[PDB]
Structures are given as C-alpha cells and as structure tokens.
C-alpha cells in the first residue's frame, strides 16, 4: 500500500532534514555509513 519512496509527502520530511527518510529504512542506512566511513 505504501512504498512511496523519498519525497516530501510520503514521509513528512522535507529536502532538509535529509536523512530522516532513513530512520526506519535499515538497508540504506548501512549505505549511509559505509559511504561515510
């Protein structure tokens, strides 16, 4: 039903606060830190 993606209006977060689409996404948070490390 969901599976919106990364927009303003599916998650309630804007273009800034530009990670909090990845609080609950487990897999792409790993790609945040490994690109950061």
Partner 1 sequence: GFRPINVSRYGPGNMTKSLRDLSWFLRYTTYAIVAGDPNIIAVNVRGLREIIENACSSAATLVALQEMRRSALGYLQNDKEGQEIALQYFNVLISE
Partner 2 sequence: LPEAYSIFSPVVDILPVIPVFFLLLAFVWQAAVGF
Partner 3 sequence: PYFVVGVLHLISSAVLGLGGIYHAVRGPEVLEEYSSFFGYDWKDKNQMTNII
Binding-site ranges for partner 3 (CB under 8 A): 25-37
Tell me the closest approach of the beta carbon of residue 6 to partner 2, in angstroms: 7
Q: How far apart are CA 29 and CA 25, in angstroms?
A: 6
Contact between 6 and ligand CLA per CB under 6 A = yes
Is residue 2 within 8 A of residue 9, CB to CB? The reply is no
C-beta closer to partner 1: residue 8 or 35: 8
Is residue 24 within 8 A of residue 11, CB to CB? The reply is no
Residues at the site binding ligand CLA, with contacts judged by CB under 6 A: 6, 15-22, 28, 30-37
């Amino acid at each position: 039903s969901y599976l919106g993606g990364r927009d303003q209006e599916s998650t309630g977060f804007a273009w800034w606060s530009g990670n909090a689409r990845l609080i609950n996404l487990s897999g792409k948070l790993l790609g945040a830190h490994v690109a950061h490390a």
